[PDB]
């Protein structure tokens, strides 16, 4: 679990969005596993606007942060799950690091701010949904 709170927006994994997120929907994209909802309170986070390929993510299944080198956002095949059919997930960045399904929502940050959130993983892999291209989150 986990979310990004920026301005009057809450960014979550689309597959973990609540009834309240959907009732206050701003934007969602199944191909990216992202959903953004509106909030009444002002958010605590700031978004990176950069091309960093290293950063640190929070891993809830270890209660720890880990450094990572990750690939640029791209279209990657993701196997079927309870939440989605087998499909290509876009704007996804992969890295070597520990993850379990419940780690979705953990934030990946570089020195410039929030880069994205955990969205996929595998045997010693962790994948992050990028949010740096969503320029409208800042206004
Ligand atoms: C962090 O997730 C994992 C980590 C280790 C192993 C497996 C997973 C689970 C995973 O990658 N899934 C299935 C559940 C959620 C939806 C994801 C998606 N974005 O399509 C894909
Ligand atoms: Zn950066």
Swiss-Prot record:
Role: Cysteine protease that cleaves viral polyprotein and specific host proteins. It is responsible for the autocatalytic cleavage between the P1 and P2 regions, which is the first cleavage occurring in the polyprotein. Also cleaves the host translation initiation factor EIF4G1, in order to shut down the capped cellular mRNA translation. Inhibits the host nucleus-cytoplasm protein and RNA trafficking by cleaving host members of the nuclear pores. Counteracts stress granule formation probably by antagonizing its assembly or promoting its dissassembly.
Name under which the protein is recorded: Protease 2A
Phylogenetic placement of the source organism: Viruses, Riboviria, Orthornavirae, Pisuviricota, Pisoniviricetes
Catalytic reactions of this protein: Selective cleavage of Tyr-|-Gly bond in the picornavirus polyprotein
Residues of the full protein shown: 869 to 1007 of 2193
Record text on subunit structure and interactions: Homodimer.
Binding site for Zn(2+) 1: 50, 52, 110, 112
Catalytic machinery residues: 15 (for protease 2a activity), 33 (for protease 2a activity), 104 (for protease 2a activity)
